[PDB]
Structure formats: C-alpha cells, structure tokens
Structure 1
Amino acid sequence: DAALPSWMPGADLPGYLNGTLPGDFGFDPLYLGQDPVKLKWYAQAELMNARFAMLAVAGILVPELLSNIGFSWPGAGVAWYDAGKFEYFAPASSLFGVQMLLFAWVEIRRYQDFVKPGSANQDPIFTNNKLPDGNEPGYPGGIFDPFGWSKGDIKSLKLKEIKNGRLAMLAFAGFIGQAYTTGTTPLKNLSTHLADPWSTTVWQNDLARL
C-alpha cells in the first residue's frame, strides 16, 4: 500500500507487507503471511531454503562445468543424482550420522538465537570469543562476516541475497523436473536446447512422450 515495488503494477497488494522484509514485492495471492508470527517464521524459512538452494545449484553446476573442460578429478562423469551411490572414503551411513550430529548442534544454536535474539552470540568454550550485540535472526555476522561486507548498504545486499536465493530455488526445482523428465543432467539439457531452441522446448519434448 505504498510506492514499494510490486509484482503486478496497479494491483492491490496486502497491507501486512510494508517493505520491512528484504525483497518485499507484495506477492502473496494465497495470503499465507497474514499471521505475523507465521510470516516471521516464513521469513527465516525462506532465507534458509534460499541459502541451501544457492549452495546446491552452485554445487550442481560447477562440477559439470569443470567436467566439460580439460579439468579432471575422481568424481567427474558422475551426475548430481548419481553421486549418492559413489565410492567414498567412508560409507554413506557414517557420513549421514556425522552430519546429522553436526547439523543438530548448529540448527539448535540457530533456533535458540531465533526464539531469543542475542542469546547465542557467546562461544560456549572460549568466553572471550563472541558476536556483536547488534544482530537480527537470520543475519548472524561477526565471524560469519569476516570481511565486513555488511558495513555498507545492508538493504541492497539483502535484496540481492533474497533475489539470488529465489532464483536458485527455482533452479533446483527445475533441476528435479528436468532430471525426472529428460533423465539427463541440466547442462546437457541446456546444450541440447541451445543447439536448436525452436525444436527443443518443454512442449515438444513432453509431446514426444505423450
């Protein structure tokens, strides 16, 4: 209900989205963020899902990009969906248990800081090490930002982060869809489409299987 950017110029956006959260464009046709507590939780959920999707898309696209060139390493021809049944130094079960314990520790710490901001900024072992007092949930800083990049325009950088995260989330969804339909890696699908985009579309490929 202001001059803030909108996802539909002229549309009547809801009033609970006043631009406080980063990347607010008034996009909520299902009104899932009506409840303030639900919206507060969904903001953190969007941030976490966005960051994990960004790391995932980077970790899916980088090995395939380096595999298509002269760079070589042990796991090169293995696809992202085939990396699970790969021979590593430890079995998948052991790695899963180790990561479950480590993620349990960091996620409980993050949840503790979410329910009480500033209550988890202190290092339990080294009492001298701590995060700055000024902090918000989902934006830890301190050791997490050693370069001090947040000292500048925190609003523009947060907007860039949420936009890149939404794009990466859609990219991961597209990765799942392309792997389930074409049954081939995403960069190979991109190359196939770039060879002749007029005859290689979702409609043509899906109609050829109907």
Structure 2
Amino acid sequence: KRDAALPSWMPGADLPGYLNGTLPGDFGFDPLYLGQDPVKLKWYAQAELMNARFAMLAVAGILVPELLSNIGFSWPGAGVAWYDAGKFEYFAPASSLFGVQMLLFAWVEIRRYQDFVKPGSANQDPIFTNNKLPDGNEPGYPGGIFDPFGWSKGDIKSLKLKEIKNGRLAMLAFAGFIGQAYTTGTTPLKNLSTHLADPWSTTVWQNDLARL
C-alpha cells in the first residue's frame, strides 16, 4: 500500500503502509513488522534518534582519539585503547564519577521524557523563567538553545534525513568495534591498516577460519 514514489530499500518490493515517509529515513524497511502498531512505532522513532545520536558521539570518541595518537599528538590519555579507558586512572575514582553521571543524567533524561509524554510542556527554564524554547518544537528536536546557529531554519527535511543516515551508519560502526575488538583483539584503526596492507588475504573469512 506504500506508494512507489518513495525511496525503497529493495526496489520493486511491496512495503508496509504505515511507513508512509513521515519519519526521516523512511525507506520502508521492516521485514519483521516491529513498527506496525502506531503506539510502538512512536516509541521506536525516539529510540532510534537516541541510540543513533549517542552512537555518533561514541564512534567519534573512539576514532579521533586514536587518530591523533598515530599522528604523534601527545596528551596524557594518548595510546589508550577505547576498551581500556575504564581501567585508566583519573583524578577521581570510577565509582564517584559514575554516581555523578547518573544524578546529572537523571535530570536531563526525565526532562526529555516529560516533553515526549506531553510535547511542549518542558520548554521553560525552572530557575530563570525568562528563558524558554520555541513553542513549535517536536519530540526529539528541541531546537531553541539546542540550535544556537539556526541550522534548523533551513531545509529541515533534508537535515533530518542526513542526521538519520549518518546516525544509522554510526550505529553499525560501533557494533563493528565490539565484533572486531572481541575477535581481532586490537584497536579499530589497527584492523583497517591490516586490511589495507593486504586486502585480499585479510577478510573476516581468512581471519576467522584461521582461529577455527
């Protein structure tokens, strides 16, 4: 029932009606019909943004620090694998940092949830009542102070599509870090260098067959 004008993950394939192009990155991909129920699909829409946005930060936070180290840039945290940052010693114990993390995140996340439950109800500064977000914001897209440079005032639809495409690719990359790190046992950029050294004999088929 989905129209044929919209982009399709599989050209010439029938696609669900409930994926009608409203959401960004709507390519009609749902072989398991997870998002069939509108109430559930409403939740999954925000979950994708949240998992995507954190994934984009996480991937950026796992490649750039390693990229700088190879270039030779020197800082005390240089040369630490992304999966060894936890063991590293900081100014405060890991437990104390974790406790502060949850208290800070509890405020912002409940603030974000309140808007999702009732959009527009969490757009006012509790202390300095003069401050406020624009009233037209939708769940997942606060705007206002969260968009200081006004990029959202342009072609918003294209920007939403660009965000979700980069976000979906970032989420796949992070799963690659866990799979690659758990198998190869080395940092991600090291795996890329190995592949570029000998692309033909360094496939996952070669690597995994050797192990077993």
Name the TM-score class by shorter chain: over 0.9
Task: Name the structure 2 match of 1:57.
Answer: 59
Which 10-residue stretch deviates more, 182-191 or 69-78?
A: 69-78
Counterpart CA distance in 1 for 2:166 and 2:180 is 20
Tell me, what secondary structure is at the counterpart of 1:208? helix
Counterpart CA distance in 1 for 2:103 and 2:132 is 23
Counterpart CA distance in 1 for 2:209 and 2:72 is 36
Tell me, what secondary structure is at the counterpart of 1:86? coil
Within-5 A mapping of 1:96-135: 96-135=98-137
State the Cα deviation string for residues 79-124 of structure 1 (Å, max 9, x = none). 0000001010010001100010000000000000000000000000
Within-5 A mapping of 1:33-112: 33-112=35-114
Counterpart CA distance in 1 for 2:113 and 2:39 is 15
* Residue 22 (1) aligns with residue 24 (2): yes
1:77, CA displacement in angstroms?
A: 1.1
Among 159, 176, 179, which residue is 1:177 paired with? 179
Tell me, what secondary structure is at the counterpart of 2:129? coil
Counterpart CA distance in 2 for 1:2 and 1:130 is 42
Task: Name the structure 2 match of 1:197.
Answer: 199
Counterpart CA distance in 1 for 2:56 and 2:168 is 9
Counterpart CA distance in 2 for 1:77 and 1:71 is 10
Counterpart CA distance in 2 for 1:50 and 1:39 is 16
State the Cα deviation string for residues 179-207 of structure 1 (Å, max 9, x = none). 00000000000000000100100000000
Among 143, 147, 152, which residue is 1:150 paired with? 152
Counterpart CA distance in 1 for 2:89 and 2:205 is 38
| TM-score normalised to structure 1 length | 0.99
Counterpart CA distance in 2 for 1:68 and 1:109 is 40
1:2, CA displacement in angstroms?
A: 3.6
Runs of 4+ in 1 over 4 A off after TM superposition: none
Tell me, what secondary structure is at the counterpart of 1:68? helix
Counterpart CA distance in 2 for 1:37 and 1:94 is 38
Aligned-residue CA RMSD (Å) = 0.5
Counterpart CA distance in 1 for 2:86 and 2:16 is 44
Counterpart CA distance in 2 for 1:65 and 1:31 is 40
Which 10-residue stretch deviates more, 128-137 or 1-10?
A: 1-10
5+ residue gaps, structure 1, are none
Counterpart CA distance in 2 for 1:70 and 1:79 is 15
State the Cα deviation string for residues 113-161 of structure 1 (Å, max 9, x = none). 0000000000000000000010100000000000000000000000000
Counterpart CA distance in 2 for 1:77 and 1:127 is 46
1:70, CA displacement in angstroms?
A: 2.0
1:209, CA displacement in angstroms?
A: 0.3
Counterpart CA distance in 1 for 2:137 and 2:149 is 17
Counterpart CA distance in 2 for 1:148 and 1:99 is 29
Counterpart CA distance in 1 for 2:185 and 2:145 is 41
State percent identity of aligned pairs.
Answer: 100
1:12, CA displacement in angstroms?
A: 0.1
Counterpart CA distance in 2 for 1:69 and 1:2 is 48
Task: Name the structure 1 match of 2:170.
Answer: 168
Counterpart CA distance in 2 for 1:55 and 1:32 is 27
